[PDB]
Amino acid sequence: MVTAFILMVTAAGKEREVMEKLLAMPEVKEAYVVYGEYDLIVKVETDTLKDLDQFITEKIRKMPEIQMTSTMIAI
Amino acid sequence: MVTAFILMVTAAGKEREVMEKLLAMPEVKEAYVVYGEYDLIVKVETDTLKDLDQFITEKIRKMPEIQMTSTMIAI
Amino acid sequence: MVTAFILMVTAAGKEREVMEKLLAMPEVKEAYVVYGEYDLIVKVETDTLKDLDQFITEKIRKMPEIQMTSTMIAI
Amino acid sequence: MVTAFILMVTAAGKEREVMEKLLAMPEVKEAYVVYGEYDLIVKVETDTLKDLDQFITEKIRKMPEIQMTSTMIAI
Amino acid sequence: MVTAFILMVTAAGKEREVMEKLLAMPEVKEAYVVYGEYDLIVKVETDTLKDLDQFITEKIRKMPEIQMTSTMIAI
Amino acid sequence: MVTAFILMVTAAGKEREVMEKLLAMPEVKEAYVVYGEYDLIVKVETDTLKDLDQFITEKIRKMPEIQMTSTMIAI
Amino acid sequence: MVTAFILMVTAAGKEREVMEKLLAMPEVKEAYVVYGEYDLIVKVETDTLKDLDQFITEKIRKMPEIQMTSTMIAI
Amino acid sequence: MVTAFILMVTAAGKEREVMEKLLAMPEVKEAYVVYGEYDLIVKVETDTLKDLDQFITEKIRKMPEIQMTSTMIAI
Ligand code: MET
Ligand code: MET
Ligand code: MET
Ligand code: MET
């Protein structure tokens, strides 16, 4: 499987709204609101790299509340 | 007790109105518009880390004029 | 001749449409959506540095979906 | 006098519009479009620090086309 | 309790032997070698901020292999 | 009066002793050891910008335990 | 197939000789010495992500002249 | 001709003796010690990019005092 950590910036007053969307997703294993330039860090897992590609470009990046993301694929 | 400094980037031209809004908050002890990568520096004091957590999420991150923050907790 | 790579951050969910627009440009030889702080990596080739200058100002910086770039010129 | 360099990010397709505003200002000594995360770097001079404070918060930061700025005051 | 994610850059080729050391530390809940600007990411859990800062300056910053860290405290 | 905040990085284990030297300077109004990127945040005040330049370049920067400083002048 | 771009920082004066070693690897499709933050930009391809992990951690990162790498996997 | 601005961080307390050296270099058109993340900013002018990269790796990166540079080529 593929494990990845996604750092996210959400629109103001929407970080909780996004967390609630994420915590209902099978791929999300853990999610936290964090201090700093990023609002959240999310740990996700997919069977294949191709599924991760789809998840992030279709589910995450298309979420109206998300303004930016930086994903760190784990070895 | 918790003392922390929050450096923040605000929308160009909104730094002063944002500062006035923050200065009105009890948790805020000092606030200055500054030159550099950051536009505002705010000093806050809260009873607990949890209160600091909530100041960041329920107050700072709900203000659309604030774009990026960096929090440094006194230790 | 000039060869350069432009790494760019785009609005969440716009990376692919931006890429298709760039791929249509003659100066663009390759373009990939990538994981990490950047969302797109583009390889361009122009006759002169001045042409590279104009590609950045008249094309890249006029596209509202592109937010931040970093250009590395081959040497 | 006070000398400072201002790094600026402008709205897409407005960097030239901003340059034209800047090149008509007495305080601007030189201005350039630059590669990178910033669109322009501008060298300004004011008689006093107080005048710089006014110039940047009133003229620069209030310019509708400007999204962010980072000023480096010179010694 | 204090939960935090620490992003680290390590001496090239030393990332794994460093991770082993980290996974040995009780404060470390999970550790991964990652792709991107950072090479490692660990999720730490301490009882107090004091213990967290103490953990970094004693076990993290003391490891020669580790060249740079960025800490995001979870809320 | 010129007010400024200095973010300082000091040689490890010297944070406390450096702060005590700073607290002894009449230019220093506040000094805090903090957690994170920077080791210290210091609030200073001088009558003129000329004095601030001299104070930082001749005193602060000459302190052997201080490695980096990022001064943010206030409006 | 997995395609990725590696941004590399090498010990000064070793950029050219490192590139020639890279160009000799069948995983490497393109390599360029560039101006700026990074010294080299390298395009690589492998059949699986597992192979990429192995290639970067066992070959790339073990090269003595390579100091830092930031790999950006493509979608 | 190629015009570029180089931002540098220097060993604390060495910024001025370093600047003197820079002002001695013919490629250097102006140099200032600045407040902020960077300590120095120089405006360089060379005939070719080749000469610019050569200027940094020969005169800039070779100075021990200089710890970090960021280059913005002017368009
Ligand atoms: C892979 S879609 C755009 C990628 C983005 N930079 C991220 O890592 O989230
Ligand atoms: C001094 S108004 C806001 C300051 C901003 N960070 C700048 O240096 O341009
Ligand atoms: C995979 S070992 C360290 C990886 C490094 N951060 C890179 O992305 O190149
Ligand atoms: C004024 S000497 C170097 C100044 C440093 N960049 C600072 O802002 O603290």
Side-chain angles (χ1 to χ4, degrees):
Chain A
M1 77 171 158
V2 183
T3 294
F5 288 88
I6 315 182
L7 287 170
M8 310 176 186
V9 177
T10 74
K14 292 296 194 187
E15 77 185 332
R16 178 162 178 166
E17 183 167 300
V18 172
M19 280 283 281
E20 300 195 326
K21 284 188 176 175
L22 302 175
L23 290 176
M25 302 184 174
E27 303 85 336
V28 174
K29 305 295 105 178
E30 77 187 314
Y32 290 99
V33 168
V34 286
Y35 281 86
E37 80 175 82
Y38 289 104
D39 298 307
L40 326 165
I41 189 176
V42 188
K43 186 192 177 186
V44 298
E45 290 171 4
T46 58
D47 293 303
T48 61
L49 176 58
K50 282 294 168 301
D51 298 321
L52 182 61
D53 291 351
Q54 181 173 57
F55 178 65
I56 290 175
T57 57
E58 306 310 320
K59 294 297 175 185
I60 306 303
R61 294 231 109 201
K62 243 72 172 177
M63 211 173 273
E65 305 105 321
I66 288 190
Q67 289 176 174
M68 87 98 81
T69 64
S70 179
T71 306
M72 297 172 270
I73 292 172
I75 281 60
Chain B
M1 191 71 79
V2 185
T3 289
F5 286 82
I6 309 176
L7 312 205
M8 40 189 101
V9 176
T10 71
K14 297 300 187 178
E15 55 264 30
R16 283 187 181 170
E17 67 104 7
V18 164
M19 183 179 75
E20 303 313 310
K21 287 177 178 176
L22 295 169
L23 278 176
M25 292 178 213
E27 304 92 323
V28 181
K29 307 311 174 188
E30 315 176 14
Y32 288 91
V33 169
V34 290
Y35 283 102
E37 178 172 294
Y38 293 106
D39 311 322
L40 294 172
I41 175 156
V42 183
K43 179 188 166 186
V44 307
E45 297 183 0
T46 61
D47 299 316
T48 66
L49 185 56
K50 177 183 181 61
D51 291 312
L52 179 56
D53 287 350
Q54 310 174 316
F55 177 71
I56 299 294
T57 68
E58 306 305 296
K59 291 189 174 185
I60 299 303
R61 289 181 177 176
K62 288 201 174 172
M63 291 181 259
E65 324 97 285
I66 294 175
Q67 297 178 179
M68 180 189 289
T69 65
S70 173
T71 295
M72 295 170 276
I73 307 164
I75 60 176
Chain C
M1 191 71 79
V2 185
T3 289
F5 286 82
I6 309 176
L7 312 205
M8 40 189 101
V9 176
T10 71
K14 297 300 187 178
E15 55 264 30
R16 283 187 181 170
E17 67 104 7
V18 164
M19 183 179 75
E20 303 313 310
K21 287 177 178 176
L22 295 169
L23 278 176
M25 292 178 213
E27 304 92 323
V28 181
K29 307 311 174 188
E30 315 176 14
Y32 288 91
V33 169
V34 290
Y35 283 102
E37 178 172 294
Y38 293 106
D39 311 322
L40 294 172
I41 175 156
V42 183
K43 179 188 166 186
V44 307
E45 297 183 0
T46 61
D47 299 316
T48 66
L49 185 56
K50 177 183 181 61
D51 291 312
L52 179 56
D53 287 350
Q54 310 174 316
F55 177 71
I56 299 294
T57 68
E58 306 305 296
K59 291 189 174 185
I60 299 303
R61 289 181 177 176
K62 288 201 174 172
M63 291 181 259
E65 324 97 285
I66 294 175
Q67 297 178 179
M68 180 189 289
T69 65
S70 173
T71 295
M72 295 170 276
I73 307 164
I75 60 176
Chain D
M1 77 171 158
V2 183
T3 294
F5 288 88
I6 315 182
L7 287 170
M8 310 176 186
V9 177
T10 74
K14 292 296 194 187
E15 77 185 332
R16 178 162 178 166
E17 183 167 300
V18 172
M19 280 283 281
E20 300 195 326
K21 284 188 176 175
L22 302 175
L23 290 176
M25 302 184 174
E27 303 85 336
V28 174
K29 305 295 105 178
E30 77 187 314
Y32 290 99
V33 168
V34 286
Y35 281 86
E37 80 175 82
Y38 289 104
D39 298 307
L40 326 165
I41 189 176
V42 188
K43 186 192 177 186
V44 298
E45 290 171 4
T46 58
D47 293 303
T48 61
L49 176 58
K50 282 294 168 301
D51 298 321
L52 182 61
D53 291 351
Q54 181 173 57
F55 178 65
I56 290 175
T57 57
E58 306 310 320
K59 294 297 175 185
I60 306 303
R61 294 231 109 201
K62 243 72 172 177
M63 211 173 273
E65 305 105 321
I66 288 190
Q67 289 176 174
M68 87 98 81
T69 64
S70 179
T71 306
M72 297 172 270
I73 292 172
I75 281 60
Chain E
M1 179 189 280
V2 178
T3 303
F5 286 85
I6 303 178
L7 303 176
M8 307 162 248
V9 177
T10 75
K14 293 295 183 175
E15 48 278 359
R16 293 191 178 182
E17 64 86 27
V18 167
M19 200 189 87
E20 301 315 314
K21 298 182 174 181
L22 288 178
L23 292 174
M25 293 171 229
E27 303 90 314
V28 178
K29 305 312 171 194
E30 52 179 350
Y32 291 87
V33 176
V34 290
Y35 281 117
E37 180 193 350
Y38 288 106
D39 311 325
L40 252 43
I41 183 172
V42 308
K43 175 182 181 184
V44 172
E45 283 179 4
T46 54
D47 50 316
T48 70
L49 184 55
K50 179 186 185 67
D51 292 320
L52 172 59
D53 182 286
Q54 190 169 297
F55 174 73
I56 298 182
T57 62
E58 287 290 305
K59 297 183 177 183
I60 296 304
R61 289 182 178 185
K62 286 198 175 185
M63 290 187 261
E65 304 86 358
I66 298 185
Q67 304 184 318
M68 187 271 257
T69 77
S70 170
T71 298
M72 293 171 272
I73 294 179
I75 291 170
Chain F
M1 167 184 74
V2 179
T3 301
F5 290 81
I6 312 168
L7 298 169
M8 313 182 331
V9 167
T10 68
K14 306 296 188 171
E15 295 95 322
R16 305 289 175 178
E17 68 92 38
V18 168
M19 170 175 282
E20 303 312 303
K21 286 198 180 70
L22 298 176
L23 289 174
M25 300 170 191
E27 289 86 345
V28 183
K29 308 305 175 184
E30 310 182 20
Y32 288 93
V33 179
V34 295
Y35 174 79
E37 36 184 358
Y38 293 104
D39 304 306
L40 289 169
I41 185 172
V42 194
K43 180 184 190 183
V44 304
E45 294 175 4
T46 61
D47 44 304
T48 64
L49 177 60
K50 285 284 179 292
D51 287 323
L52 182 66
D53 298 324
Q54 195 146 53
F55 175 69
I56 294 170
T57 55
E58 298 316 312
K59 291 178 185 171
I60 301 306
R61 300 227 117 205
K62 302 300 185 181
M63 287 179 79
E65 322 91 295
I66 287 174
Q67 294 177 176
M68 290 178 253
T69 61
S70 186
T71 307
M72 305 169 119
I73 296 164
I75 265 63
Chain G
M1 167 184 74
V2 179
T3 301
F5 290 81
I6 312 168
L7 298 169
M8 313 182 331
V9 167
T10 68
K14 306 296 188 171
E15 295 95 322
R16 305 289 175 178
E17 68 92 38
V18 168
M19 170 175 282
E20 303 312 303
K21 286 198 180 70
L22 298 176
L23 289 174
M25 300 171 191
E27 289 86 345
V28 183
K29 308 305 175 184
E30 310 182 20
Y32 288 93
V33 179
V34 295
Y35 174 79
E37 36 184 358
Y38 293 104
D39 304 306
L40 289 169
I41 185 172
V42 194
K43 180 184 190 183
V44 304
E45 294 175 4
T46 61
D47 44 304
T48 64
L49 177 60
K50 285 284 179 292
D51 287 323
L52 182 66
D53 298 324
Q54 195 146 53
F55 175 69
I56 294 170
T57 55
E58 298 315 312
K59 291 178 185 171
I60 301 306
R61 300 227 117 205
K62 302 300 185 181
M63 287 179 79
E65 322 91 295
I66 287 174
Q67 294 177 176
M68 290 178 253
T69 61
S70 186
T71 307
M72 305 169 119
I73 296 164
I75 265 63
Chain H
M1 179 189 280
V2 178
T3 303
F5 286 85
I6 303 178
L7 303 176
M8 307 162 248
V9 177
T10 75
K14 293 295 183 175
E15 48 278 359
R16 293 191 178 182
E17 64 86 27
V18 167
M19 200 189 87
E20 301 315 314
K21 298 182 174 181
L22 288 178
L23 292 174
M25 293 171 229
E27 303 90 314
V28 178
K29 305 312 171 194
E30 52 179 350
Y32 291 87
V33 176
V34 290
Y35 281 117
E37 180 193 350
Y38 288 106
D39 311 325
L40 252 43
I41 183 172
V42 308
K43 175 182 181 184
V44 172
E45 283 179 4
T46 54
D47 50 316
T48 70
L49 184 55
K50 179 186 185 67
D51 292 320
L52 172 59
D53 182 286
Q54 190 169 297
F55 174 73
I56 298 182
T57 62
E58 287 290 305
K59 297 183 177 183
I60 296 304
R61 289 182 178 185
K62 286 198 175 185
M63 290 187 261
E65 304 86 358
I66 298 185
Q67 304 184 318
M68 187 271 257
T69 77
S70 170
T71 298
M72 293 171 272
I73 294 179
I75 291 170

